[PDB]
Amino acid sequence: EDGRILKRFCQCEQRSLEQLMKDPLRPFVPAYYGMVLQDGQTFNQMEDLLADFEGPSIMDCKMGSRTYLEEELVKARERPRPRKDMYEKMVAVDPGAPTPEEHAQGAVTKPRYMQWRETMSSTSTLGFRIEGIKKADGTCNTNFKKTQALEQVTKVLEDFVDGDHVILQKYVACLEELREALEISPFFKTHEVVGSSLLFVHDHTGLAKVWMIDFGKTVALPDHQTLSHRLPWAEGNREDGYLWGLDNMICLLQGLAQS
């Protein structure tokens, strides 16, 4: 559309957006405009987050210690469904990361793949991981499958803010105010948030912002029930590591800001 973007419909994201529009997180999420049909498909219509920017830099971090839903792991034993998809996306990073049985099948299960991807990157050590970068100069990078150690992550962050400090201060101020809103938010408090990202965008005019995006697997907990989002995940507990991720992120960016 026009200052608007169409995203492939899914129910879970619809229901999350319509709730978030009424939540203290509203300022930190893309405006939600409703749905539409076009060229044979159904779409959620969304705010174009880039609208206000001139030649933006852009970074997307997946947030959390766990990236798959629990009924993926408890449904991976009852009726297992191995994927060609994921074996290849795995072998294209580490061959012989597969097991001699996974080898002969050309197939890995989802929780297995998602698990391996969590340990091969910063997710299991920091509770967040860089997924994507596009810089002011036209270059970009989505190859972060082995970005794991604290010093690899900080190098990428350094290159992205590109010595602008200013812009880096602005981003810690966004993340710090995000965190105050997450802590008092009924939506966050009553949802499992897995697979979602923080989108960092900024300009040579010094404009900077962070949004929460991707609510395709943000799930409602049963009545009155809450998460700390800090406590470590164990099958049954539904913990996220979302706020563990955020705390670590804020800490590291402040560390850059001293520098």
Ligand X SMILES: O=P(O)(O)O[C@@H]1[C@H](O)[C@H](O)[C@@H](OP(=O)(O)O)[C@H](OP(=O)(O)O)[C@H]1O
Residue 200: name the closest of 188, 192, 210 by CA.
210
With respect to ligand X, which residue has the nearer C-beta, 117 or 229? 117
Kindly state the smallest distance separating residue 50's Cβ from ligand X, in Å.
Answer: 21
The residue sitting closest to ligand X, measured at its beta carbon, is 195
Q: Out of 130, 217, 242, 249, which residue is the one contacting ligand X (CB under 6 A)?
A: 217
Kindly state the smallest distance separating residue 250's Cβ from ligand X, in Å.
Answer: 23
With respect to ligand X, which residue has the nearer C-beta, 24 or 216? 216
Binding of ligand X at residue 132 (CB under 6 A)? Answer: no
Q: Out of 89, 134, 135, 238, which residue is the one contacting ligand X (CB under 6 A)?
A: 89
Q: Out of 141, 195, 219, 254, which residue is the one contacting ligand X (CB under 6 A)?
A: 195
96-125 as b/e: b if 16+ CB within 10 A: eebeeebeeeebbbbbbbbbbbbebbbbbb
Binders of ligand X among 108-127, rule CB under 6 A?
110, 117
Kindly state the smallest distance separating residue 147's Cβ from ligand X, in Å.
Answer: 13
* 170 annotated as a binding-site residue: no
Annotated binding residues for ATP, as ranges?
Answer: 7, 47-49, 60, 134, 214
The binding site for ligand X (CB under 6 A) comprises: 89, 110, 117, 195, 216-217
